[PDB]
Design a protein around this ligand. Structure first.
Ligand code: ATP
Ligand code: CA
Ligand code: CA
Ligand code: CA
Lengths: 367, 123
């Protein structure tokens, strides 16, 4: 029984290889006391419980833009995952973990070390998240557009392996979108003032936002009619109306200038990655643009990516955008499938190999 | 990979066909070659001997319209693994039911057949 853990900036996804969906999805947050020693309960809380008790904790995210920045806190996340979420003893299970593209060498080693030395895993494997999403989509070649909470990436992959030179990174993702939505609703005339403000605005974004096919035309419709407006009930029971904010918020993926960024949008980043690849494979990248992650979850996003890439590529290029409804957990599902393969027991780093080679074994086994 | 079916792959010119069955690669009886379950996923290795005698490898994973995500995922991954096992010498081809390449359709002298059903998901 292998375990699959997909660690993200915002959310940890965890479960059992062979399941078709994560068993546990929780915020990637470690809470520690503001004042030590004076009250019952150094000391820590993880996930939803940390969020609940946030008024008396200092909350931290161990993962920033997909990369681990606090190993002490990451360890708390894994301990909670094993013991509280999956309810397993980690020494009893092979563990598949996931990593960002271009994950620094020292980080891959530290993760391996923590698994074998702290958690006594009998076996582990680290897989690249985008490659996992591609496999989940039943493809070995394509370009993955991964957008989560802290980071977006375009990742071309050919015959099973990412092309590192062609990879592009956009530091604009879901957190930026939630903030932008807060900003533009505030300007409309609303005021999100309670402690639940970030979650209310995030929920409005997740429930009511969409990507406009033609942005200027939607702005028009929205200005001239009330056809696009939706009501949203606040926790207190107040009902507010969400107008053009529904599509203006995710528009910032296509127009990072909305956010004060000079960078290219997601359609252009995708195109730029494709153009860094050998001309002979481009047609297969355009024909296999896989969307993956929570921030790809907006309705209309695929149609807009198709439209934008169509305008960027020669007119005879076949463009296919692949955006399955379950794409929020594509990485996890690809891991589940990989970890279930009759061939997976020969892929993993065993405790025995770790003992003989130490943490640098990961570079030789996992790529 | 130590996959027992890998040890057999690509030894002589010809066609070899495996079905994904519950996260494993299972060879298809040679007398069934060309009848595909639309609810299943398959890995097809075509070995061609050039005029030199040198072996050339094309690797197709075929996806039934109703195959479950574990089957199409495993077919893709098994394809990469077999390619790696073959020192990277296979050219990989995604084949979708109803949209196969002429090259792939050409492997079946009396034309491939589709039939409904198949082996249950490994999930
Ligand atoms: N239906 C939805 N529509 C739009 N955004 C969504 C939806 N569901 C979730 N999100 C957003 O997706 C983000 C979390 O997605 P995901 O779990 O893929 O991120 P992560 O893996 O934690 O982050 P990263 O990949 O950046 O390290 C959050 O910003 C969340 O608000
Ligand atoms: Ca992620
Ligand atoms: Ca099947
Ligand atoms: Ca190859």
């Amino acid at each position: 029984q292998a375990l699959v853990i997909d660690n993200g900036s915002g959310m940890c996804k965890a479960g059992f290889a062979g399941d078709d969906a994560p068993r546990a999805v929780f915020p990637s947050i470690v809470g520690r006391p503001r004042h030590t020693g004076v009250m019952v309960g150094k000391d820590s809380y993880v996930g939803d419980e940390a969020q609940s008790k946030r008024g008396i904790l200092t909350l931290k995210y161990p993962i920033e833009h997909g990369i681990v920045t606090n190993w002490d806190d990451m360890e708390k996340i894994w301990h909670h995952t094993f013991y509280n979420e999956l309810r397993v003893a980690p020494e009893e299970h092979p563990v598949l973990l996931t990593e960002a593209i271009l994950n620094p060498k020292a980080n891959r080693e530290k993760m391996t070390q923590i698994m074998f030395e702290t958690f006594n895993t009998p076996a582990m494997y680290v897989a690249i998240q985008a490659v996992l999403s591609l496999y989940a989509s039943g493809r070995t070649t394509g370009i993955v557009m991964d957008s989560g909470d802290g980071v977006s990436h375009t990742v071309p992959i050919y015959e099973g392996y990412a092309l590192p030179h062609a990879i592009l990174r956009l530091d604009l993702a879901g957190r930026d979108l939630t903030d932008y939505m807060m900003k533009i609703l505030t300007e409309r005339g609303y005021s999100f003032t309670t402690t639940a403000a970030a979650a209310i605005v995030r929920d409005i974004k997740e429930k009511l936002a969409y990507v406009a096919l033609d942005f200027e035309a939607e702005m028009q419709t929205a200005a001239s009619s009330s056809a696009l407006e939706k009501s949203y009930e606040l926790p207190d029971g107040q009902v507010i109306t969400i107008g053009n904010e529904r599509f203006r918020c995710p528009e910032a993926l296509f127009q990072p200038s909305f956010l004060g960024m000079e960078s290219a949008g997601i359609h252009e980043t995708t195109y730029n990655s494709i153009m860094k690849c050998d001309v002979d494979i481009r047609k297969d990248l355009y024909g296999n643009v896989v969307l993956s992650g929570g921030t790809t979850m907006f309705p209309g996003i695929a149609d807009r990516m198709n439209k934008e890439l169509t305008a960027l590529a020669p007119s005879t290029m076949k463009i296919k955008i692949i955006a399955p409804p379950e794409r929020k957990y594509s990485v996890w599902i690809g891991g589940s499938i990989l970890a279930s393969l009759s061939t997976f027991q020969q892929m993993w780093i065993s405790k025995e190999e770790y003992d003989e080679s130490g943490p640098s074994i990961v570079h030789r086994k996992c790529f | 990979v130590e996959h027992p079916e890998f040890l057999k792959a690509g030894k002589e010119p010809g066609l070899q066909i495996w079905r994904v069955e519950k996260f494993d690669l299972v060879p298809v009886p040679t007398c069934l070659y060309g009848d595909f379950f639309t609810g299943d996923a398959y890995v097809i290795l075509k070995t061609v001997q050039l005029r030199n005698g040198n072996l050339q490898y094309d690797l197709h994973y075929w996806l039934g319209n109703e195959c479950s995500q574990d089957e199409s995922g495993a077919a893709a991954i098994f394809t990469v693994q077999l390619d790696d096992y073959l020192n990277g010498r296979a050219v990989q081809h995604r084949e979708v039911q109803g949209f196969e390449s002429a090259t792939f359709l050409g492997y079946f002298k009396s034309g491939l057949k589709y039939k409904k059903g198949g082996v249950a998901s490994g999930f």
